[PDB]
Design a protein around this nucleic acid. Sequence first.
RNA 1: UCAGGGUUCGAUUCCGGAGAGGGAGCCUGAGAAACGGCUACCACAUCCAAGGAAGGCAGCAGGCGCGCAAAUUACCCACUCCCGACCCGGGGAGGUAGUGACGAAAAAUAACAAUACAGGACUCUUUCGAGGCCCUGUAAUUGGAAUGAGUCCACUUUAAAUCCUUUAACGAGGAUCCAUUGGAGGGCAAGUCUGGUCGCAGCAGCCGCGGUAAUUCCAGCUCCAAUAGCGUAUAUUAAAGUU
Lengths: 182, 142, 126, 59
Amino acid sequence: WVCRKTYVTPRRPFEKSRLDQELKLIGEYGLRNKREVWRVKFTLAKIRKAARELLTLDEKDPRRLFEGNALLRRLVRIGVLDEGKMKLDYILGLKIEDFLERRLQTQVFKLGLAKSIHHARVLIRQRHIRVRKQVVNIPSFIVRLDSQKHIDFSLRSPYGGGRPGRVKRKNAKKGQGGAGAG
Amino acid sequence: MGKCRGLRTARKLRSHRRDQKWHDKQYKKAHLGTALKANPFGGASHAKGIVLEKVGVEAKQPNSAIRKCVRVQLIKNGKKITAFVPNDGCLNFIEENDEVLVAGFGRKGHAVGDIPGVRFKVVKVANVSLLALYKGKKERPR
Amino acid sequence: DTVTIRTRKFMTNRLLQRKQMVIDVLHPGKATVPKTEIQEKLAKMYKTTPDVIFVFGFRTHFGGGKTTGFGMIYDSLDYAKKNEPKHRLARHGLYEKKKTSRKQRKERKNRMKKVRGTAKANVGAG
Amino acid sequence: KVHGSLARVGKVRGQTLKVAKQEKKKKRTGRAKRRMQYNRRFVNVVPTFGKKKGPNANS
RNA sequence: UCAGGGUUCGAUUCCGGAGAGGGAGCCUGAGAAACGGCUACCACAUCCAAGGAAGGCAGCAGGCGCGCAAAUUACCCACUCCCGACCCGGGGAGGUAGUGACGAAAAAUAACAAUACAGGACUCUUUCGAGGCCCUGUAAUUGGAAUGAGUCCACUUUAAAUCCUUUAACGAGGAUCCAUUGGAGGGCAAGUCUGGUCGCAGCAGCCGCGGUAAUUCCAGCUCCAAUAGCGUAUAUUAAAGUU
């Protein structure tokens, strides 16, 4: 039906300067590939293009008002922008890293219960967390501002209340069939 | 500069450009179609033929080597093309009076490297790649 | 388990003589229970008894915890038995189909086409 | 010398020794391959005076 | 595809048009110069007791041929609509499944402690040295913990079923529940390592490598890039202010 790409490739194939930035950025946040990086940078450069229009439109054009007002609300609703700013010039001061703070795996680590970031991604996938009432398996949730005070573990897991795993209950049955009857 | 900048000179611009575009080499091949008629390909990426007989082809200086090509007749034209064979010992995996699949070098019209008179190479002998014959993950199907 | 049946946007659909709502269901440590069990509980929430209740849908969300379907409740049997698409009546049996597979119809039809006056052989006889 | 003509194919590949030392060790994929790449280059932290070394050096 | 201006493509799901082997003529009807109607000629091809008779898949499947090149002689009118004298009948329209690395979205292939060395802020000490913190890989075994991949009863899905989601019971110690595709002289991210070959064999888009000391060939080890994808050929755009 309707399909389109969510990322673009770099114009240069190789460049010592570029590769180090993409590598070290992936190291911090535990990302799997550069396709998880360029995805972010497509969205950002798209938003940077839309903003770049409206600044050149006449001040108090109706198109410029209605777009900007509802746009900045969305940037504030995800929390990559403040309302102590609230104008279009600060869109261009926005950059790549601020998004990545609002990723699920980043917020698990930063404001919750994890070891290193590499641990935290595994917890999201193995279904040990929820967002308000709802299980997730996607570390690319990007998390709305309101939902940061509802990040909790899951209500059926061995982490908190719920049935144990098959490593524990296995060893429990080693007390009954591994050394209790075997 | 040195040319009209009228306001009613759309005709004198758009008819001039349509003429001086034909002096370009690239454009003149695309739109006359003399390309299609002269080529042994129909513009198709590959083509298929039947072997006529192995040959040895001498190299252009400074390099000196013997390059062991083949010569092939085609299915759908009956005309003849001289085609390179890749890596060491892959000549043996091509046997006379069988079919092969050919393909251009990667320069799209011109002879490549130090070998002259060759503009084509060979990729598959009989639904089996030169790679798997060479590497040894497949065998001759006969 | 202990499960909850919970309404959602009721309609008194007088023209078809039924009452159609959503069947919003919560299940705690389980989810996805038989549809038969569901209509029992709805029988003893509007006192209409479970043979004029009909339900279907019931897709279960991730992790369990909720399931949502669509249910009808007819005033009498005959209003259901008349209106009702056949497969929903046969869903808890009182009707079947036969008929018989597909094809045996078309190959007979074209043979019936090539006779005139008497086609009673082909209707029974091949 | 060259004896038994120099037109012969399969020459260099049919007179070379064939040896191996195929792995028993399993290499990492996906996430962890980038994790090691990050730590081994930048977060060690070794670097010293101007040098040419590269990330390979079997010299 | 693209800064601005453009360039290239449009058989192909919507709308309009034209045509049902090639030509011509015509019947019926409100509407047709109709081909799932008819008549003739021409090109084909079938049956025949040789007197005659019958045919047009650029409809859905399927076969031969052609080529570099393309799926099941499957299930069903429940949905969506249409047709009829009709609330009831019919529909290869259409829906459903199969084949499917054209292409697009999502994101697993091991995470955490013990010991072990290793680094540096910090502390003590004239220094040596010692303590200790933050972390790192890396050896040695392990230990505890977790999960779907699969296998699979039940429910659900639907016309009937599959898939998906939901749930029993089995299901991880790294040797296997195994990530590959290309490259390492320069352009261009990575070996003036080891063995073999000696202008031979081969590599090389380009510039160039090989004539017995090959950082470029054939192999081993190591390293680099992208990654469930990567390479190659060809059309075409940007690069091209080289239209």
